Design a protein around this ligand. Structure first.
Ligand SMILES: O=C(c1ccc(NS(=O)(=O)c2cccc3cccnc23)cc1)N1CCN(c2cnccn2)CC1
Ligand SMILES: O=C(c1ccc(NS(=O)(=O)c2cccc3cccnc23)cc1)N1CCN(c2cnccn2)CC1
Ligand SMILES: O=C([O-])C(=O)[O-]
Ligand SMILES: O=C([O-])C(=O)[O-]
Ligand SMILES: O=C([O-])C(=O)[O-]
Ligand SMILES: [Mg+2]
Ligand SMILES: [Mg+2]
Ligand SMILES: [Mg+2]
Lengths: 518, 518, 518
């Protein structure tokens, strides 16, 4: 038995678990999108080509750092490597480009302006925090500058302050009008321009700073597929991002990063307003107790699955692979469990952006996700997503669920979906079939954006529109068959589900056919 | 609400995920046992006391290294630290001692000659490896030492051999008659006395070596509670461990460690023959592909849960805490998911044996387990264990599921069980109540062995047996009431369930009472 | 096998249906209560003896006819019959006495004058209804009188009027000041003093008339066990009845009869106010379209089951058995499907009151019920009753659900419950065990009232209270054992469940034991 099909027939979850089988090889298709952060280790054209071959689907640009021109060149190299495979349209793989905003970050200043300079803060020592720019480049063991002007307004005597991704902690003893006097609680060696978290503080920085405004405008001009908007606290923040992008960037997907308590409490209204959600475990594990992160992760992935919107699990997934060519057992486990949880995508940060094994990290993500998709208990997942999804009069929605039902019944090799905007394919993906969803499109952007949805293998038809509708459908359907056979999803004589519109220019995908592979 | 009781009421697993809430705090009780490997960083009487206070339930000793004299000292210290709390029998925590056999290991030697400490080899490099035994002192990046004779009886050319937690990958370029030259693939930092794995070979080493025989006999002499048997490949391996322990060590629990392909494949006969199971992920993730471990882990926990036998999840759960005071996010997830999987106990190795933050590690496991236990979907778990329960005429079994049902209905503070052998408490634990199980025993050994069962808080009643049954019963009940109050499990006015026998002895548990706390 | 135990292990409802086996003989015990209307055909001490032997649990007296002294005679004969078996306390079966009030009935006047003649009406013919008391004794095929003064105020042209328990249909063609001119819909002989129904008309007779009051007061003097209150339309109706019964009759159960549209629309408040419900299908089927009766039956049985309150299914169950000794197929089906619906009791009207075969009717209900009860899909029933019953701090509720859980686990012969008021036994019955519930009481009245609850076999202890509580429990327990052996419920060596309290008095059931039958 293949792809855990022995465990798939179990009537209980428990028995399904008991039947999982390390000798039951998975199918070749991998449904979960892989998002890579690009930096020094992975920004060369030649390295990017191997990232694509290994499984990268989306390139993430971290606008916390780097100049516009530095990112412009990262974008170019990505497009260059992606297009280098375009000569064969059957084998071509769209690669999305995402921009991760700085958002309302709080950063320290420079330590004695030296570079190789740190100070060892001793636990129990006092440290003054000032906001006076004359100290902007003169930080040491007694005085510390940071860039959050109104920090005194939202902090109180007894408040905690984390510095350098939570490695150092301080507790505030005194407030002056425009300074803080703190006591070191967790000692450490403090470098320069490090990140500051204020857990439980009602931080009043703008959702979109002036810099973000510029950054978003830059993204529009560079044709980015999606925006990962940092530190989203409420629905109004999303609407702000939406308004900046405006008319010109209306088709750019906005993915809200939930990285603090507020985002978690306001999660429902953020989800309603966004196109998708990133569980940003880095900051979140600082802002709320680390032992509670898994709950937030599961809750958010559950609600997105329920709502039908993509959700990305991020940060520290294969962390130890920054230095090592293999991951820990806990890391292998965390990737698989993000998939079983329901994550549409998984993400690499430092592993791809700066580490010593960017390609091995991508490869490992691809291998684990594939195993985990086979182990999904589709029988219960399908029963539940239905029960929790409303009665609609939308015909493409009815069609989509009919097709997933049909794909489980004939165990089909794929669900081929013809789509312009991608919506029809998304509506199929939300019901989580086991068969890969081959979305044939002519819109290059919809092709790139489809990577956000579990199961979608997006495919770009380069052929010009034939005037005879029936023939043009056939062209696109046959192209999907050819892609499938080439990648080994299925072979001649296999059964596939094909979804198409009935009428030329209906805007509905309301037709399903069960069809042998030619 | 509290302890995820909102998610507890959900009609589907999806909806249950959607309701998990980081602002719903866990109960104070912690059902999952914590087993700690004791070594250089944690073997002092002073550190041990803190380990007990942090939450350590079982002290593991790894017999891969160390003399009999070294280990007796550690055992001595564990007992001294444990007995340091015996003055108040209401606060005494029984601590089990476990012996982890070396088993059929294959290891390496020292370094260079000028310093037998720590060196390296480069990437893609080549490497001479020996089947002669003169070069153990001087092993560097050129010519390396193993300890396996009939190697090439079971080996091939171009075959994979791994080294040092398999962080070093090598393929044999060519062999000969019985010696090795190879080529590096995953180059890294080479150290001293590092482990070697041969994925694929049905290795001919014995299950219980001559050294194992000495260690097991030492184990009997020392009165150990349990044995972790390394590299169990089949049921006759377990029986040979049982035979070496013999009449004298017949009450010692045998826990088979499943850490290669054969053990996975023969899991059923091994489980039937064992007292419980360890999922030993360190070696398992080298012996089988890393991406497959989580499947082997969830299958084994599933089948153990179904059989009612203890299962331990082990290795690299909090690995990065060897050097850091906080875990990664993947580590947070891993611990949490082992608990949601159904694991009776989670284990720490390097994290407590040799790392810089042993106390932090134990405390992090304690916090995560508790959060995870609240997030369990008991409604479905209890339903499935009941359906997948063979119906029996066994009266003790009927009382036990009766008790668990009752404890859900009235959300009780505990299930109090009076037990001599532990069996009665084990019967309650296998139905996975949410409420902690206070197992009151006069037998010190069963009190220690009970740590293996999820949910069991064992308490050792030191008071003389009383002649009247009823009064002796009521004195042990009251002792349990006082422990629970003292540990904050419940308070005056709370409801508990109480399981007892109709007369003295084993197999007579047939009485369940719903009782207020006085 | 036996009692469809094969069918009850099925994992689906459909599979359950598939396995029902006409050759699977049921267990001797019959859980569903049987209520019989006493009349001319059945009031002799001698017929009443055979009614009991045949399975009658409740004797219902209709107070629409006959003097108080008449009913007191009938009552005395019920009591004589019941007490004839009293010499042997182990075989004695309590029998309940129920009072069914007349309520707001509408009745015609006397036909012709020549005693009680039966004028025949013809389809198409004109009939006139009048309140002119001149025709009080002078009804005929042209002009008919009835006892409802306000009929003209509450009827309209087009209204349907029904006569003789639904037999004759009339349509209002002409309303006068004093009279109605109607056209006959279907022919049929009209008797004297027949019953009238007005569907879709706001009838304004008091739900508790002055006759009702005397009758209820009489009930109290006569020490009846329960009242079946006719034509209950709303909660206040039920509260009036409770008031009339007052302090003296507080222990008397009020069962509301739902017989019209309003009763069904305001069902929820009526249930809250009542001790139980009667689905009174004779009138109900005339008051609402006949094709809707099953919807309301199944709705009310469902809701009563969910609230844990008794529900009775009544009227025309075995109708053809008034004139024949074998029922129709439709009737065999209706009794079985009422038990499958969830009804605690089934009832006989004319069958036992005025029919030529009273004893054949009682036996046929006894047989059908016992077959139907074995066809119950207990797996899903018990799962659902759990999920949907609250989490409560009430100890006796936990004990109760614990005991039903245990009784499924060990397939017990019975659940024995010691109860003073009956509540402990009621609490078990709401979870619908398969095993008969032997309720041992010393209170003759609760013994009689227990017949309202599915699965309770009441037995009345006559022994004197023993001074030592512990011994006085065992005395009653042992009595239930003896009762079970004689009744063929179980034998020596079978396992039974026993529920007792920790002290004398009501509200202290907290102890469940699983115990071998001695
Ligand atoms: O490892 C898993 C697991 C396996 C597969 C999982 N993903 S799944 O097959 O797609 C799935 C299946 C059914 C419902 C789902 C709802 C949301 C997300 N995934 C669902 C999720 C978890 N366990 C779930 C069942 N287990 C439990 C745990 N607690 C109570 C009952 N069963 C043991 C561990
Ligand atoms: O004859 C029955 C039936 C059988 C048993 C019934 N009662 S039961 O076993 O105690 C039962 C079982 C499960 C839930 C119940 C809820 C309320 C009352 N009874 C329940 C009630 C009805 N049915 C017709 C066929 N049935 C199917 C078969 N396949 C699909 C859907 N329904 C089930 C209901
Ligand atoms: O920003 C992030 O990606 C994070 O904090 O996890
Ligand atoms: O033996 C172990 O602990 C392992 O390999 O995981
Ligand atoms: O009164 C009744 O019992 C009826 O109408 O069924
Ligand atoms: Mg962040
Ligand atoms: Mg090992
Ligand atoms: Mg009536």
């Amino acid at each position: 038995q293949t792809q855990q099909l022995h465990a798939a027939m179990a009537d209980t979850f428990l028995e399904h678990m008991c039947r999982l089988d390390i000798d039951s090889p998975p199918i070749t298709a991998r449904n979960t999108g892989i998002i890579c952060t690009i930096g020094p280790a992975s920004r060369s054209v030649e390295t990017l080509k191997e990232m694509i071959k290994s499984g990268m689907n989306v390139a993430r640009l971290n606008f916390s750092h780097g100049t516009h021109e530095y990112h412009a060149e990262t974008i170019k190299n990505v497009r260059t490597a992606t297009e280098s495979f375009a000569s064969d349209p059957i084998l071509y793989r769209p690669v999305a480009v995402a921009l991760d905003t700085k958002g309302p970050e709080i950063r320290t200043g420079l330590i004695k302006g030296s570079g190789t300079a740190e100070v060892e803060l001793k636990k129990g020592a006092t440290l003054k925090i000032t906001l006076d720019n004359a100290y902007m480049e003169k930080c040491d063991e007694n005085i510390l500058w940071l860039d959050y002007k109104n920090i005194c307004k939202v902090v109180e005597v007894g408040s905690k302050i984390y510095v350098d991704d939570g490695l150092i902690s301080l507790q505030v003893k005194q407030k002056g009008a425009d300074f803080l006097v703190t006591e070191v609680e967790n000692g450490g060696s403090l470098g320069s321009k490090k990140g500051v978290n204020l857990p439980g503080a009602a931080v009043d920085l703008p959702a979109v700073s002036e810099k973000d405004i510029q950054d978003l405008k830059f993204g529009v001009e560079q044709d980015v597929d999606m925006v990962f908007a940092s530190f989203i606290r409420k629905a109004s923040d999303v609407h702000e991002v939406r308004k900046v992008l405006g008319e010109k960037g209306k088709n750019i997907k906005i993915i809200s990063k939930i990285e603090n308590h507020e985002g978690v409490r306001r999660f429902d209204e953020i989800l309603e307003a966004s196109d998708g959600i990133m569980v940003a475990r880095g900051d979140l594990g600082i802002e709320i107790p680390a032992e509670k992160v898994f709950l937030a992760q599961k809750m958010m992935i559950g609600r997105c699955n329920r709502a039908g919107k993509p959700v990305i699990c991020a940060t520290q997934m294969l962390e130890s692979m920054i230095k090592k060519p293999r991951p820990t057992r806990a890391e292998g486990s965390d990737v698989a469990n993000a998939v079983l949880d329901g994550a549409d995508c998984i993400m690499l940060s430092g592993e791809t952006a700066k580490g010593d094994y960017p390609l091995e990290a991508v490869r490992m993500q691809h291998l684990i996700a594939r195993e985990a998709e086979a182990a999904i208990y589709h029988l219960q997942l399908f029963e539940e997503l239905r029960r929790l999804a409303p009665i609609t009069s939308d015909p493409t929605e009815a069609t989509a669920v009919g097709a997933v039902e049909a794909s489980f019944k004939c165990c089909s090799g794929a669900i081929i979906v013809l789509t312009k905007s991608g919506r029809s394919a998304h509506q199929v993906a939300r019901y989580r079939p086991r068969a890969p969803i081959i979305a044939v499109t002519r819109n290059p952007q919809t092709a790139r954006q489809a990577h956000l949805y579990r199961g979608i293998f997006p495919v770009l038809c380069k052929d010009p529109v034939q005037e005879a509708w029936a023939e043009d459908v056939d062209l696109r359907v046959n192209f999907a068959m050819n892609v499938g056979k080439a990648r080994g999803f299925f072979k001649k004589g296999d059964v596939v589900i094909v979804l198409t519109g009935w009428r030329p220019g209906s805007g509905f995908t309301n037709t399903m056919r069960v069809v042998p592979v030619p």
